[PDB]
């Protein structure tokens, strides 16, 4: 639908993010063609965020919530679950399907 999750390597299949829990992830963001626009791995600093706060796009909110600790997954996010018709001028084109390589390192 809006976000498809395909496992690259498995987690414990038991430790899923709760409410008020901080997800710690490494991500690589690419356009559908496969052109990289961002990576936390380029900065050697994991990205931290809290689920259910609308801090991140809907695809991450619903995608990362399905992942268990240790899991590396590919998220294919349709425009309506990403930056939609508007996109982000000079970053994300209009109507862009985004592919994120996401690794859920731990929860805090």
């Amino acid at each position: 639908m809006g976000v498809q999750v395909e496992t690259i390597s498995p987690g414990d299949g038991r430790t899923f993010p709760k409410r008020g829990q901080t997800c710690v992830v490494h991500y690589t963001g690419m356009l559908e063609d496969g052109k990289k626009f961002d990576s936390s791995r380029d900065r050697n600093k994991p990205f931290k965020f809290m689920l259910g706060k609308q801090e991140v796009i809907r695809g991450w909110e619903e995608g990362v919530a399905q992942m268990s600790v240790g899991q590396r997954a590919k998220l294919t996010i349709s425009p309506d679950y990403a930056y939609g018709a508007t996109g982000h001028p000079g970053i994300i084109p209009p109507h862009a399907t985004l592919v994120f390589d996401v690794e859920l390192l731990k929860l805090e």
Binding site: T86, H88, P89, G90, I91
Partner: protein
């Protein structure tokens, strides 16, 4: 009112205007007064303490904003928000 709370509220609102509503002018409207407040210099010990802690980071974020205003290159604006995000996390209790 404490400089860290004014910067917390301003950076949060500015990020909402730019990333939420694709409104760079609105973002700049929120940031300019806070940068001006810094430029007037610290008055209290807590304001002096804040300026010493995060003065450098906030100055480099403004520099990237000025570079963006000339270039029109969003990459320069994302560099500024990388520093603003860094400051936001450090200052936020």
């Amino acid at each position: 009112i404490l400089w860290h709370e004014m910067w917390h509220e301003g950076l949060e609102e500015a990020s909402r205007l730019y990333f939420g509503e694709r409104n760079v002018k609105g973002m700049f409207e929120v940031l300019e007064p806070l940068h001006a407040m810094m430029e007037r210099g610290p008055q209290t010990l807590k304001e002096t303490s804040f300026n010493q802690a995060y003065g450098r980071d906030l100055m480099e974020a403004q520099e990237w904003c000025r570079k963006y205003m000339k270039s029109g290159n969003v990459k320069d604006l994302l560099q500024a928000w990388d520093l603003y995000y860094h400051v936001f996390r450090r200052i936020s209790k």
